[PDB]
């Protein structure tokens, strides 16, 4: 994905996370360790590729439609 | 992405395409060549990775919400 797309997708992932009062540590705890803070952080910065499958899994985790996370 | 996820995502991409009466050639024509028949075909079989950005672009092209294409 383009740098801009990855950056914007990561920004929405960060916004949705913070919006429901979760820190990266909080995400790791709530997900029983499935979603590691370091990994989610990398997705949010756009430093690591977020696959469609992963995006769908995160959307479900956060309780929001995939559309809300799309740039 | 898992083989099953890629396969299912491709199946929905194929279903939506055919549903609106477009052949792979038709897609290449309607998209002025942006979406090549060989490439879209590979996405449909799950032989080539479909990025989130690409999925969003295809959803727009087909005129359907991204959700309709998600396994």
């Amino acid at each position: 994905m383009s740098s801009e797309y990855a950056k914007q997708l990561g920004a929405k992932l960060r916004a949705i996370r913070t919006q429901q009062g979760l820190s990266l540590h909080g995400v790791e705890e709530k997900s029983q360790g499935r979603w590691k803070a370091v990994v989610v952080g990398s997705y949010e910065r756009g430093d690591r590729a977020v696959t469609v499958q992963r995006l769908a899994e995160l959307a479900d985790f956060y309780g929001v439609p995939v559309q809300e996370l799309l740039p």
Side-chain angles (χ1 to χ4, degrees), chain A residues 1-6 8-71:
Chain A
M1 300 187 268
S2 73
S3 299
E4 195 54 48
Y5 195 89
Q8 286 180 41
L9 172 63
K12 290 203 171 177
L13 274 168
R14 181 188 286 89
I16 279 58
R17 168 175 66 71
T18 56
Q19 274 178 40
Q20 61 192 71
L22 292 176
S23 61
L24 287 174
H25 182 204
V27 168
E28 190 168 307
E29 293 176 301
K30 187 173 187 177
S31 69
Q32 324 285 58
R34 188 182 186 192
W35 308 132
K36 294 292 192 302
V38 173
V39 180
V40 176
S42 62
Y43 295 150
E44 292 181 356
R45 302 187 307 277
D47 289 347
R48 180 170 178 174
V50 174
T51 67
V52 171
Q53 180 171 36
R54 194 69 68 191
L55 185 59
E57 305 175 320
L58 292 173
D60 289 20
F61 174 71
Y62 288 128
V64 303
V66 58
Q67 191 59 57
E68 279 192 52
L69 302 175
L70 295 181

